[PDB]
Structure formats: structure tokens, C-alpha cells
Design a protein around this ligand. Structure first.
Ligand code: ADP
Ligand code: ADP
Ligand code: ADP
Ligand code: TPP
Ligand code: TPP
Ligand code: TPP
Ligand code: MG
Ligand code: MG
Ligand code: MG
Lengths: 541, 539, 542
């Protein structure tokens, strides 16, 4: 009856709701990975901790419980800090478990001795180095609860080697119960009535449904709220799917005109950050009334004054708004100058998009490639879209129908999360298909992770590379003594990386090769790579 | 006419609700204090930034909007981080405005150049170095709003000298409006009913009223709650006053008894920290069920599992409880085996208290001295108690009837907040009398600030020193080569410091002098000091 | 036999050369202060850890081994970060020992649980929380060694409660030997001959003697080099005493003219920071050639380029400059246009200084008061001068004849170091007298420490308060509502604080009261206070 620290941590994580663990083993975190599998936690051995830390953050967004990134002492943990910042920026729960040198070797210049707690502090809600084996379950339970309660964030546990490998009696350790699900605070009664009056007194109302509404699991109530009020709504890049992107109330093609003309905006789990242009002119009405629904009280009132503050959980507050529509029913009129003005902009944009999508010139364009892509993604798949032009075009091109089904660079604009987040999507959804659509540069960050996807049999992932030979484009030839900083090797056969694990690679340059190569890639028994070449001068609209 | 960065900061502070500023002037924050008085902010020049930063955190607890501590670059700002940590520990809104060297001198070894941002960060919710003059009102509103929203805390603004001395067109500076009061969060209706179920099913219930409820300013709602349900309640040291200490529902004389045998406990703005012994045995039921009411979601479930999590503002949640109680009337029975057990200990403990306050022996004891102080403090006064035994015995002997009328060491257990919090209490309540009962050791931390109190005419403050010649006691004689590390000068006449500003000092050794000296000091036109000698053996 | 962690760290501190400890006791650092006295370390209980941490940094400058500031967990340690920063700014060795809650209570909201390592690190060369009891001497030896080797600085030791109270058999504890003194590296012969060739070519040379040369204890070698070369030298505020302030080679009364007209400058343990105007115009020649002698290689070349870099110990490199002169003797001539120019400004500034001292009017001025103070201070006493004008006017008027005999605000310009530094001076030098000349504003930062000085029988300290009723002056009548932010109580009786411990206070307001009150305060058997009133509108020599 002797239990080790790695055993205690592994069982504690499984008890507190951890199911997926990513990272790379080594001194001294080897036992933690072995016991994680022996306790019911799937461990995925990545090729670089940077990509593994991004996968851990994506699990916190998809499942509601934090994903664990395991890194060795010193540099292994430091690589994982990149993911901590991403979870810090996107408000996602995630745990970074970093090994450390033997505590009795501190100050001696031990192997991989580093100020790991201080390196994780700027992006962590919680840092801790446990003091004893018997109190390890206290730190794990506190680490999980801190990551999901309130505004979700990243936490870090510093595990010295002697605690990982030390042993003690099992009857003496105490395992706390699985901490309850994150409490859902509600808005005050008087504020819900004030939020309705502002919406009922709006000439040009607008609803913004963002990442916070998707993470809050509030898809049912938002669809009930919008369909009952018939309000025009705008989805964030990762709010797509909370409300179906083919819904009539969506004004996404007229995004710029809606934000510029709106006088009362309802924020549903979204922030007025760089993505929303800080809510300031010339993109917004300088006197726009703002109703903000957010779980963080400090976020309320950022950049733009907030007239009605709905501090609390997006799912708990939206039920109050739905409860307001029962003792006081109200619908927004279906024919106003605001509706007809917007609906003209959508039909104009959609005509321009289709006119650009139907162009078949070679070298191909984004819209031409995204036509064959869009018509082959099933309505229940998971889109992973990383890149610059590729990601932005696909945002408006590829629709989503279920919540939390699109993953991109997020609020931090991080390159390198792509293949990492795609593996996390296949670990959470092993029966659904994941489309990891990448640019040539973004794929180069975590490109070696294609072998990881195949080693765990994640054939539900199809890697699609939109290549234009550089960051925003590159030439057809390169002078080795005069390479542009953004240029890459022209016509780089990235798809030949599929031969590492015996998979299929496709090199597409003409619209005829597009659909057949894509069709056979999805049917493959191993993760296939489709490398599509486009024009370097191809741009947006 | 043009406006300077110092004048921009002062007006923006006043607009966002700042009314009190403490600190010491100097390079380069001198113009800030000048426009502070000019824009209507009461500035108080302290003797040390350490005591000033504690007065700032006290104003945040008393008013609901953060007091400001103004410190010079380098050493001045670093001294103010103490109060930042105190507000960080007590969840109080507080602002430290530390000057900096001119930005065009960074890296040159400028005057008082220091990593001030990194020094404040471990205790700050928000550190910011404003980038330009036009955006100064943006950072000021963001600092105040971040200090009072959510769980209150301390923030820090790094103001370089050139930002302070620079000027620009006044009409080109945009001042955001006064940010609204801290938004109230409410608990789900199912959580209210589950808390009522646990309280109704409780064999031995207990309500712990903490200072989080006092800061929430829910005294009117907590009294409607407890008076309706007749639940026995225990108030934290700074939770006193939310309910009058003479209320029959109080079980404070038997604190160690109720915490030991309470099957269901209701935490009303109270934290299960070291004060509550972590909610663990031997002082707690190993299976105690907790109904936790706190605004910080991360705090819920700490140390002890929380069955009913009432996350949100204490005033809004208590209002839900009262609304539920008047639609579903329930009262804890007045005759219970639980009521008859605590009441016996309350009567038994109260008997030993009376037999200790009747002690007339010289040197005196804590209980004899506090008996006369208790008889002379009105019901509307404010008590500031600091020390160890002096403060703990004063917690159980001083009665508080209005909320937020007692200021002690706080959740940090800080020695040095005494005179700072007393000065803050006198500036917020110039109409009430402020009692500052200090230990001789605690008085050494900030006793120089009696001049600050006298300089601003704060004759409503009475400094009472309870002197046992050291930290928990001191010997009668001292040899300089054999001074105990906890001993001070025997019979140190601290009251002589009242003669610095021409005040009255009093030296009491026998109970015959207690009442006359205390009554004479309250009537003094200048802040008087009463130095009371007590026995080093009394416990 | 079993030994506790408190006794392990107390013995290890004494073994590593720690002699003085300042702080305030309380949970959980009580056994440390008790066991320190049992092991030979002298503990001084202050009234505030802030003043104690300033006293601990002063011990490092006076002795070369770090003084220790002892603080309780949480707020006790945070108060002691001020001294860490002051030692960090002045490059002095200093150790802050802060308590911490029991390790088995982390994350529980324990009593005074705080992120103390992070609070100290911005000013720390070394932060460490010892992992076990048997390795406590390892962390003590490394902390001392780090604080004194290379560029000296402040270190921090984080001691949890159960590390202090735990015990184990004394045999298993390895006590490392007393770490050797700081090594004294030196410059190449090429750099030595180049620096000597630079001085030999200077039309208008100037030598700057900073407290880095004082800390290095190179007073004999500096006096041997300067008296051989006859080079005009300027002494920084705490660089005074390395050379006798009454030296014909001193051009301090003409500091502005010397720094401007100089074309070659030798930096002896002094930085080109705010105190030296960054070596920039209009106070310096734009084409000034600089020879910099500094222990820190990273400091070489700051603001102004360094033609000749002499990286190493000031005492070791000055020895090389003397060996080079013993083989190639060279003297700067004493009748140059550079000399006669500086002396013309010196004689005229000295006349204006002598005139302001002759003023007998009431209220008195800084010069009349210092005229009497200067004449009652022995040539081997220690000067603690803190304030604004009080500190700056005193530096020109208070001559120091021995190195490391003046303590002021330092490179950080700190208010609150005064009384703490005076107590540390008296503890190091109980034979010499300590004069603590303070401004009325500066005195209030740590005024309660007068009782600490009396409690330990420090009769060799005399507290002198130059009172102008505010920060740089103040009115003579105060309305309690309309209070200037820089003014204090008019005619405050700070001398009454001496009566706390039975001492004697003196309230001086006339010139005929200075000498009788000052002469009797020095001879008191308890530390006395002399509160001297001056004019609020009193300035310095323009
Ligand atoms: N369960 C929840 N209920 C309400 N708000 C939440 C919840 N979880 C996160 N949020 C808030 O949602 C916000 C995230 O918005 P953001 O991701 O920037 O919008 P976008 O979708 O445009 O990226 C955060 O400020 C966070 O506080
Ligand atoms: N407006 C508020 N409503 C509810 N809880 C609050 C509010 N403001 C602060 N709190 C909480 O009250 C708690 C105060 O507990 P503590 O400082 O330990 O006081 P005490 O122990 O004296 O009750 C903090 O944890 C804080 O999160
Ligand atoms: N033993 C030593 N030998 C040489 N230089 C030293 C030694 N100790 C410290 N120093 C240097 O002295 C410098 C201190 O300069 P500073 O305090 O600015 O002098 P001052 O204030 O007297 O002008 C530091 O840069 C430090 O590197
Ligand atoms: C970690 C990180 N590194 C770098 C960047 C900057 N960045 C943004 S997009 C991009 C390259 C885009 O690659 P790709 O998809 O090939 O470009 P596109 O063809 O879509 O323009 C880079 C380097 C970033 N946002 N994050
Ligand atoms: C900043 C700080 N320094 C030191 C302490 C340790 N401490 C706790 S209570 C106390 C003073 C106790 O003495 P006193 O105030 O005279 O009261 P007594 O208990 O003797 O009546 C001290 C120094 C602390 N809590 N905070
Ligand atoms: C910690 C700290 N707080 C504040 C200052 C600003 N400051 C510089 S000098 C000084 C005091 C000036 O008054 P005083 O000591 O009476 O000197 P005087 O003008 O009489 O010479 C102050 C507060 C500082 N340098 N350090
Ligand atoms: Mg590209
Ligand atoms: Mg005492
Ligand atoms: Mg003055």
C-alpha cells in the first residue's frame, strides 16, 4: 500500500475531471505520463511542447475542464508557457504541469533548474509548488477549480523530482471530491428589465454572439432569445455555430455596416478588444448604447461605456432574458429601414463573393479553392483554420452550424496552434471529422505534428494546406543570397510529409485536381495532406 | 489655456469618485498634490508613505471607492507597496500613484530609477504606465474601475515626471464619465432554495457574518434576515457592527463552541482563512456543510467543500434570501438543545469576564483598562484597535453597533496600519469620534503620525496606548547589552509626543487615573495621547 | 544532539561573518532572533522593519559583510524590501531574512501568506526558499557569497515556519567554512599604461573619488596615487573621507567649473548617473575622455563612452597605478591655467560661504547653524546627514577626514534611512560618536527609532534636527484646513521625543543657544535631541 507522487497526481487529475493530457516525457515527468494512462487519462506524445500546450488549451474550450500539458524541467516547461498565454488570452481553462529538479539540489545548478514559477506568472491565474506528497490532491483540486471558476484561465503546477518519485502510504492521502461545475452567477433583476428597455428603444439594434457564449454552453437559449425577438445578430470568428451561419437573422456579410449603424449593441460573451476595433469610431457610432454580458466584472466598461451590465454566466443570464419574454412578450419588427438597409448589403456582398468564387484562373485564388472545400465539409465537422489571408477568407467562406466547431488563432492571433488544436478536436470528437486548413507559413510552425496525428490513428483529420509560397505570398524563384523575409521555397511539397507515416499526399495546382484529391483524402485510413497552390497576388475583397 | 498632466490626473481622479489622497510630496509628484487640493481632493501629507498607503486602503473599505496614495519615484513608491499588499489581502479598493524618472532618462541611471511596475505587480490587480497625456483619463478610469469591480483590490499607476509636467490643449482631453458603482451579481433561484433547505434541515446552524458583508453595505438586509430567521450568528472581528453586538442572536462569547459543533454554517462575506482556522478540525465539524456567499468565484470551495455556492454581491444575494423568507416563513426555534448549549457557555464566559474587569491590582490588566474605555466610547464612534493581546482582548470587549466602525490589523495581521487607518476614519467621518487603541509595539510602527493628525486639526482622534513594555510583555529593567528582542524601554512615556504639537499627554498607572485621563483627553482641542501602563503578566 | 533550524541558520550566519541583525520579532521568526544572540550575532529590535532594512544595508557598506534584516511573514518582510532596494541602488551587501507561513498550509490562505520571493526579486541578486533543514547552511553561505562577490547587492532568504521550528541531529548538518573575502581582479598592463598615458596628456584633468573606492577600502592607495600625481580631485557625497576633505588637491568648492572644463576624467568607484549629470552637456565637455574603474563590467561605458576601461577592484587597480608610477614617476604641475582657474573659483566661493556663516540674524540660516555644528564634531566622528537642503548644504560644510564616515540618502535619494543608518554606525563603531543631522521632514520617516537608540545604550548618537517647518520650508501659522502639502506643524517640538526614554531635549532658536545646547547634548548619558529652528526661506549659495 505505497503510492507515489505521480500516482497521486494522476488519480487526482482524473477525479477532478481531466481526461486528456498532452506533452513530451523525460526527466522527471516520465511516471506522470505512465500513470495518466493507467488512471484513465489519454496521453498524447507531441513533437514539441509548444504545440502540446496549445492542444491543452483547446481541450479546456471544448470540454469545460482544463487540458493538461506535461513538460519536463527547464526548457520543456518554458515551451509550454506559449500555450499558457493563449489560454490566458482566450479565457480558456488549462493546466501546465512542469517538472523540476530535485528540491535538495536547488542552488547547486541542478539539471534544468530554472525560475519556472516566475516564467509562468504573467499568464497564470495560479502558480504552486506543492510542499508534500500528502497535500498533492489539494493542489490539483485547487488548480482545476481556479482554472474554470470565474473568468477561466491557465494555472501552473511546479512538481519537483523528489515529490514525483517519492512514495508514502495510500490510506493517509486524502482525495477531495470532484469540484462542482463552475457556478453560474446571474444578473440582478433590475438590470434585466433595463436591458430589455434599451433593446425595445433601439432604432438599429445589434446582437454580438462571441466566444464566451459558446464556452458557456448557451447555444439553446441564444437561439431561443434571437428567434423570439427577431434581432439582427453578428457572430464572432468563433461564435459561428452558436447560431447557424445560414440563419436569416445573421448579418455577417454586412458586418462593417451593422457595427457602424448600430445604436444599441448586445454583447453576448464578447469583448470590445482589437477584434471589435475597440468599439470606437470610425467603425462604430460614437454614442452607441452598450449592453454587456460577461462573466468578468473587470471587463465591463472597457474602451466604451456600458449602459447595462449583465455580469454573470451567459447561459444563466440569457434564461432571464427568455423569462422576460414570457411575462412581457416582445418581437423586433421584421421590416424596418435597418433591416432593409442591411439586407441590401448582404445581397450585394454575396453577389460579389460568388462572382469571385466562380473565377477559375490559374494560379488559383482563395475563393476558388474555398468553393471545393466548402462543398465537401459536412455540417457536423470541426474546422481548424490557421493562417492570415486563409483564415480570414475562410471565416466568411466556410460556415459553421454547431457551437464550438471552429478553431483558429483566437484572441491572441497565435501561429502554431493549428495542428495542435486539430489533434485536440479529434481527441474530443473521434467520430466527427476535423479539417485542419492551414497556410504555408502556419503549417511550418507545428508541421512535425502530422506524425503525432497518425501515430494515434486520427484519420478523422484531413490536413489542407493553402500554399502561396510565403507569408502573404512569395516569388516563383529565390536568390539564396537575397531571400525576402516572408518568402519560402517555391512550390514546397509539404504533402510529402504524409509519407513519414505511410499516408497519402496530394499536390494540387489546377481546379480539376481539387475535388478528386480532397475526396480521396477524407476517405483515407491515415491522415492525408492536400497541398494546394494559389496565386501569391490573390487577396480578399 | 493649457492643462498639465498633473492637473489632468487630479480632475480625472475626482470625477471617478476619489475624495481622499495621502502620501508625501517630492520629485516629481509635487504638482499632483497641488491640483489634488485644487480639484477638490482632500490631500493629507503623512510622515511616511507606509502609513499613508494604509490610510488609502482604509478609505476604500470605508467609502467604496479607492483612496489614493501618492509617492515619489523609487523609494517613495516602494514604501507604498505595503498598503497595496494590505488592500490585496483585505480585498479593499486602493490606488498607489508612484512617480517615475523622466522617460528620456531610462537606462542612464536616472534619479530614483527603479523597476516599480515589477515591485507592485505581486499585489496589484492592474499596473499601468500611461503612454501619453491625452490618455491619462483613460488609465485613471480603468484603474478606479478595476479596483472596485469584482473582488476589490489595489492598482498601481506609473507616472513619469515628463507625463506629469507636460501640457496640452485642455479641450483636446476627453474625460470618461464616472464609472458606475460595482455591479451586483445575483445567485440562481435554485441556489437560494438549496441554501434555505440546508438552513431549515440544520440541527445546529451558525451564521458567520464577515467584513465582506460590511463592505457590501448590506447591514439593513442582514438585520432583516437574522431577525426573521432568529439564527445564531458569529461576527468576524471587522464583521462586527453589521448586527449590534448586544443582539441576543449573537453567540460571540462562545465562539470556540459553535464553530466546534455547527452542522451547517453560512458564510456571509466571510473567508475560511486562518481566522476561521481553515474550517478544519479540531475547531470544526469534520463533515460541516458550508453555504458560502462571496463575490469572488475563485474563493468558493477553498479549504472546505462548499455545498451551496452563492457567488455574487452579499447585498443582492441577502435580498434574495429575505424575499424568499417572507414568501416562505421559517424561523429557527427559540428553544433548542443547540440554543441552550451555547447560551450556557455565553453566561459562563461572561461570568469570568466580570470577575476579571473587577480586578483593581496595580500594575493593571487588559480587562480593567478596557472597562473604563468601554464606558466612555459612544455608540456612533469609530474604534481603531491594533496590537496582539491588546487587539484580541479589545475585539471581545469593545462593542460595535454600526457597521464599518471597527478597524484592526485585518486579514494580513499588519502592524503599522493603526494611525493610518485612524486618520482615514477621521477624514471620512469628521463628525464622529475616532478611538485609536494601540499596543506599545504597534504604536512604534507609526506613532510619528500623531503630528499628521494634529496638523489637520483631527481633534476627534484620541490615541490610547496600552503599554506592557514590549511585544507581549516587557521586563521592569533593561541592560543595553542584554535587551530581549521583544522588550522596549520600561515605562516609555510615549504621551510626550503630544507636546510636539502642543497637545496633552497622559500617563496612567493606577485605575484611579483611568476615567479622568480618558474623559479629559476626549474634550481636548488637540489630539491627546493616553499612555496606560499594564502588567506584563496579564493575559 | 538535535538542533533546530533557527539555531542552524543563526550559527551559519555567524560562521559566515554576519555580526549584526536588525528587525522586529513575532511569529515565526522569534527563535531566530533569540538563537542569534546566543551565537554571537547582535539583535536590535527596531520600531519598523523599513528603518531596520536601511540599517542592515548600512552594515554592508561599513563592514564589507552583509547586515541582516529580520522580518516576520507577510507585511514584516514587505516592509524590509525598502532596504533591499536601497542596497540594490547603492551596491551594498544586505540580507533580508523574511518569515513565511508553514509549508503545509500553502494555498489555504494561511496567516500572512504572501508572494515574498516575487516582491523582493526586482531588487535581489538572489532569492531562495531553503528546501530542507540539513541544507540551511548551504543557502546561508550562498546568500552571503552572492551579496559580496562581484557587484555587491541585496539577497533574500524565505524561511517557512516549520523550517525554523523543525529539528534534526546536529551531525548531519554540514557547516561550510567562512566564505573567502571578495576577490580583487585587476586590469591589464595595457589598460594601466593607456590610462596613465591619458592622464599624462590631459590639459585639464580631474579625478572623481566615489564611495566605490570607499567600499573597496582603497583610501591608502588613492591617497598614495593622488599625492604623487598632484591631480585635482572631486569627491562624491559619500566618497568624502577617502581623501582628507581639507586637501589642497580638492576642488569641491568649484565642482561645477571642474566638471565642465575637464577633458580627461578618472572615475574611481563612481558612476555617471544623475549625481554626475550623466556626464552630459551643458555640465560636461562633449568630447570628454573617461577612464572608468568599476567592479561591474556592465557599468563600463554608460551614457558617456569609456576610452580606457579598468574593470576590477578599486584597491587592486589603484595598486597597479602606483606600481606604474614607481617606475615612471609623473606629476601634474601645480602652476597651470587649469589650477589657477579652479582656485580662483574656490577662493571666491569660500568667501561667500564664510560670509553666510557670519550672519547672526533670527531666524537662523543653514550656514550659521552648521557653523557651530561643524566646530563641535570630532575629526573621527561619523556624520549621518539626511534631508534636502539640510543634506546638500551639509555635504559642502561638513568635512570628513576618514573613509566611510559619512552616510546620506545614497544613490537612491531615500528618505527614511537616517536614524537606521545612525544606529548601524553606532553598533559598528561604539567608540566613535555618531552625529545624526536630519531635516524636520526626514526625521519623521523613522523618528520613533530614537527609543531604539536609547534602549541599547547608544549614548554615542546625537540627534540634530534642522527644522524649517516643512519640506523645503513652511509657514509659521497653519490653518488645519488649508494645509500646504509640504508643510508641518510650525515650531514642532521634536526634541520632546527624548523624554520618552528619559533623555534630554533642546529647542534652539537663537545663535547664542547653539553651542551651549549642542555641547551639552554630546555629553549626555542618553542620546539627546537638538531641535534647531531656521528660516523657511533659507537657500544655498547660488
Ligand atoms: N460562462 C461565461 N459566461 C459569461 N461570459 C463568459 C463566460 N466565459 C467567458 N466569458 C467571457 O467572454 C469573454 C471572451 O470574449 P472574446 O473571446 O474576446 O470574444 P470573441 O468571441 O470576439 O473572441 C471574456 O471576457 C470572458 O470573461
Ligand atoms: N461586495 C461583496 N459581496 C460579497 N462578498 C464580498 C464583497 N466584497 C468582498 N467580498 C468577499 O468577502 C471576503 C472577505 O473575507 P475576509 O477578508 O477574510 O473577512 P473576514 O474574515 O473578516 O470576514 C473576501 O473573500 C471577498 O471576496
Ligand atoms: N570593490 C569595488 N571596487 C571597484 N568598484 C566598486 C567596488 N564596489 C563597488 N564598486 C562600484 O562603485 C559604483 C558605485 O558608484 P556610485 O554609488 O554612483 O558612487 P557615488 O555615489 O559615490 O558617485 C558601482 O558601480 C560599483 O560597481
Ligand atoms: C506566434 C506567431 N508568430 C507570428 C505571427 C505573425 N503572423 C501572422 S500570420 C503569419 C503567417 C501567415 O501564414 P500563411 O497562412 O501562409 O499566410 P497567407 O498566405 O494566408 O497570407 C505570421 C507569421 C503570429 N501572429 N503569431
Ligand atoms: C509588519 C508587522 N511586523 C511585525 C508583526 C508582528 N507582531 C504582531 S503583533 C505585534 C505587536 C504586539 O505588541 P503590542 O502592540 O505592544 O501589544 P501587546 O500584545 O503586548 O498588548 C507585532 C510586532 C506584524 N504582525 N506585522
Ligand atoms: C522615501 C522618500 N519619500 C519622499 C522623498 C521626497 N523628499 C526628498 S527630500 C525630502 C525632505 C525635505 O525636507 P527636510 O528633510 O526637512 O529638508 P530641508 O528642506 O529642511 O533641507 C523629501 C520628502 C524621498 N526622497 N524619498
Ligand atoms: Mg501564405
Ligand atoms: Mg505591548
Ligand atoms: Mg525641512
Amino acid at each position: 500500500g505505497q503510492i507515489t507522487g505521480a500516482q497521486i497526481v494522476a488519480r487526482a487529475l482524473k477525479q477532478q475531471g481531466v481526461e486528456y493530457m498532452f506533452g513530451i516525457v523525460g526527466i522527471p515527468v516520465i511516471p506522470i505520463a505512465m500513470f495518466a494512462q493507467r488512471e484513465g487519462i489519454k496521453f498524447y506524445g507531441f513533437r514539441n511542447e509548444q504545440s502540446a500546450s496549445y492542444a491543452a488549451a483547446a481541450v479546456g474550450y471544448l470540454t469545460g475542464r482544463p487540458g493538461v500539458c506535461l513538460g519536463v524541467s527547464g526548457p520543456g516547461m518554458i515551451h509550454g508557457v506559449a500555450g499558457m498565454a493563449n489560454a490566458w488570452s482566450n479565457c480558456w481553462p488549462m493546466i501546465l504541469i512542469g517538472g523540476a529538479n530535485d528540491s535538495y539540489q536547488n542552488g547547486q545548478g541542478a539539471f534544468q533548474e530554472a525560475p519556472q514559477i516566475e516564467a509562468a506568472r504573467p499568464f497564470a491565474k495560479y502558480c504552486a509548488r506543492p510542499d508534500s506528497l500528502a497535500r498533492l490532491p489539494f493542489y490539483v483540486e485547487q488548480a482545476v477549480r481556479t482554472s474554470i471558476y470565474g473568468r477561466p484561465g491557465a494555472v501552473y503546477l511546479d512538481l519537483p523530482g523528489d515529490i514525483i518519485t517519492g512514495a508514502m502510504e495510500e490510506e493517509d492521502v486524502h482525495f477531495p471530491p470532484r469540484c462542482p461545475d463552475a457556478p453560474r452567477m446571474m444578473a440582478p433583476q433590475e438590470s434585466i428589465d433595463a436591458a430589455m428597455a434599451a433593446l425595445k428603444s433601439a432604432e438599429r439594434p445589434l446582437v454580438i454572439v462571441g466566444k464566451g457564449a459558446a464556452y458557456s454552453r448557451a447555444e439553446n437559449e441564444v437561439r431561443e432569445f434571437l428567434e423570439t425577438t427577431q434581432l439582427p445578430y453578428l457572430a464572432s470568428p468563433m461564435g459561428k455555430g452558436v447560431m447557424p451561419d445560414d440563419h436569416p437573422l445573421s448579418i455577417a456579410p454586412a458586418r462593417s455596416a451593422a457595427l457602424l449603424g448600430a445604436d444599441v449593441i448586445l454583447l453576448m460573451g464578447a469583448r470590445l478588444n482589437w477584434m471589435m476595433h475597440f468599439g470606437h469610431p470610425p467603425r462604430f457610432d460614437p454614442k452607441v448604447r452598450v449592453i454587456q454580458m460577461d462573466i468578468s466584472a473587470e471587463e465591463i466598461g472597457t474602451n466604451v461605456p456600458t449602459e447595462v451590465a449583465l455580469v454573470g454566466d451567459a447561459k444563466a443570464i440569457t434564461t432571464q432574458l427568455n423569462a422576460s419574454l414570457k411575462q412581457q412578450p416582445w418581437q423586433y419588427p421584421s421590416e424596418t429601414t435597418w433591416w432593409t438597409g442591411l439586407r441590401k448589403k448582404i445581397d450585394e456582398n454575396g453577389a460579389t463573393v460568388a462572382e469571385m468564387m466562380a473565377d477559375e484562373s490559374v494560379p488559383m485564388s482563395y475563393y476558388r479553392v474555398y468553393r471545393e472545400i466548402r462543398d465537401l465539409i459536412p455540417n457536423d465537422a470541426i474546422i481548424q483554420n490557421e493562417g492570415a489571408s486563409t483564415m480570414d477568407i475562410g471565416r466568411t467562406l466556410m460556415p459553421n452550424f454547431l457551437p464550438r466547431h471552429r478553431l483558429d488563432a483566437g484572441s491572441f492571433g497565435t501561429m502554431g496552434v493549428g495542428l495542435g488544436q486539430a489533434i485536440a478536436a479529434a481527441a474530443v470528437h473521434p467520430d466527427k471529422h476535423v479539417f485542419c486548413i492551414e497556410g504555408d507559413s502556419a503549417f511550418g510552425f507545428s508541421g512535425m505534428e502530422v506524425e503525432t496525428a497518425a501515430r494515434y490513428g486520427m484519420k478523422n483529420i484531413t490536413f489542407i494546406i493553402i500554399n502561396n509560397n510565403g507569408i502573404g505570398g512569395g516569388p516563383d524563384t529565390l536568390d539564396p543570397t537575397r531571400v525576402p523575409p516572408s518568402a519560402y521555397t517555391p512550390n514546397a511539397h509539404y504533402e510529402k510529409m504524409a509519407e513519414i507515416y505511410g499516408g497519402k499526399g496530394y499536390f494540387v495546382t489546377e481546379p480539376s485536381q481539387l475535388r478528386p484529391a480532397l475526396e480521396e483524402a477524407i476517405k483515407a485510413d491515415k491522415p492525408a495532406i492536400v497541398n494546394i497552390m494559389i496565386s501569391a497576388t490573390s487577396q480578399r475583397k
